[PDB]
Ligand binder design. Sequence first.
Ligand SMILES: Nc1ncnc2c1ncn2[C@@H]1O[C@@H]2COP(=O)(O)O[C@H]2[C@H]1O
Ligand SMILES: Nc1ncnc2c1ncn2[C@@H]1O[C@@H]2COP(=O)(O)O[C@H]2[C@H]1O
Ligand SMILES: Nc1ncnc2c1ncn2[C@@H]1O[C@@H]2COP(=O)(O)O[C@H]2[C@H]1O
Ligand SMILES: Nc1ncnc2c1ncn2[C@@H]1O[C@@H]2COP(=O)(O)O[C@H]2[C@H]1O
Lengths: 200, 200
Amino acid sequence: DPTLEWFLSHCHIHKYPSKSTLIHQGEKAETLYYIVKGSVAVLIKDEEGKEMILSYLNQGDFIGELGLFEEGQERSAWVRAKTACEVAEISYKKFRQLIQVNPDILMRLSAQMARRLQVTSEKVGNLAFLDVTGRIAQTLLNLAKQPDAMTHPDGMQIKITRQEIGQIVGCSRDTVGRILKMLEDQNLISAHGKTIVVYG
Amino acid sequence: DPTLEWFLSHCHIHKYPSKSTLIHQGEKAETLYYIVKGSVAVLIKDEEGKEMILSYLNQGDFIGELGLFEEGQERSAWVRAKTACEVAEISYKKFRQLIQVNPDILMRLSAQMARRLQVTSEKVGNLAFLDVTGRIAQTLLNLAKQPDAMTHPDGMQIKITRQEIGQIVGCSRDTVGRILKMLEDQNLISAHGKTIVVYG
DNA sequence: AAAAATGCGAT
DNA sequence: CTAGATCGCATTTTT
DNA sequence: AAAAATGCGAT
DNA sequence: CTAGATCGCATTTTT
Ligand SMILES: Nc1ncnc2c1ncn2[C@@H]1O[C@@H]2COP(=O)(O)O[C@H]2[C@H]1O
Ligand SMILES: Nc1ncnc2c1ncn2[C@@H]1O[C@@H]2COP(=O)(O)O[C@H]2[C@H]1O
Ligand SMILES: Nc1ncnc2c1ncn2[C@@H]1O[C@@H]2COP(=O)(O)O[C@H]2[C@H]1O
Ligand SMILES: Nc1ncnc2c1ncn2[C@@H]1O[C@@H]2COP(=O)(O)O[C@H]2[C@H]1O
């Protein structure tokens, strides 16, 4: 790709070890991010410390872009590295320049903001409509289709803690587990610890 | 404002009577909207017909913008008119042109997309964290602060059906009502039918 | 050992 | 009435 | 009347 | 155990 190559050339690159945190919530926003390599997680916490995963982002994804359109804006959430991470970085001020040079880039950002709004809205519906069993059953299906799923003679094999399934669908580790036994109880899946084979 | 005036001049205007529907969900997307006057509601329905209000939009708000960045895109939700409505309209194709003429407009769109993502994410958290009492108590507070709230010697007076409070916080008309009696039972509010005075 | 992540029944 | 959450108790895991 | 919107207890 | 939803029944509302 010609454009984004021109873009990066204008960004410093930084790497973050997995589990580290790239964007702090509440903190003043002035920089834009573009994940060159690695995946992360965007999450918001409750007063008590409880977390809720709003999304995962990957290669070719921008981050910290929500405060780019109105001075004195704060980070809307925490962004933690899921894996090692190589991330390009540029200042809004700097970035805004590029925009005026070539608009095509702002068009790339906006598209991601668009797709982002769809899925988050889809997420509002899920919490509003489906029950936790439904929400988990859907997450396993989705995860079983991502690139990090391994092949298995009976379907797909994923590996994830129950804590996270709780932090994705919005329930508690305790409910996830109970639900997980049922789904197996119904030969729908097979779980052993963090390993789950989604049959199909 | 100089820009948006240049914009409208390029859009046909259409009016929609209240309760009518401007954007059909699922339908192919090719047009952009900008509410010149009136307010609307963006909503998604469940398989059974049940509705969930993702948001309300007003004067100076764009609509149907999510399918503007990738050919063959479908409307992500229903958009129904809350009041009479005067709405400017333009085709993506046409709109994209303007972008290349002046980028500033795409910058206005994107900002709204940004703000939109914040609040929807804030909404995901609400459904995940707070209970229905908490979610309703917050809606009444918010609504009591909008421009259509009327002054009252004991606080603010809003007027809304319980069906809607159910469609905003994600509960059922029956739970809203029960919750509403409690909040009054606690001299927090005072409700008579569709009328509610939020004390304070 | 370290450092977390459970598990399931019970209320 | 049923789906979830929070505790009570007993055991198992990645850094 | 039209046309919806409830209300609350009960399970 | 508690918050919600779904039904059972009886009455009240904006077009
Ligand atoms: N309303 C909620 N109730 C319980 N857990 C929640 C809620 N919203 C988000 N969560 C989080 O999701 C997590 C799932 O696993 P845990 O039980 O370890 O901890 C849970 C909380 O941190
Ligand atoms: N719902 C969401 N979906 C995807 N990414 C999000 C969401 N909410 C926040 N983010 C990202 O997380 C970032 C947190 O800081 P910013 O608000 O600067 O920008 C935010 C977005 O890049
Ligand atoms: N999971 C849900 N359970 C119940 N009602 C819901 C849900 N999600 C959205 N709703 C809608 O919210 C509305 C609130 O008022 P009603 O009971 O008239 O009808 C309800 C449904 O149409
Ligand atoms: N969560 C949301 N918040 C605000 N507006 C939304 C949301 N989801 C959808 N919309 C608007 O509703 C429109 C429905 O059709 P489009 O997908 O073309 O574009 C969508 C947005 O303009």
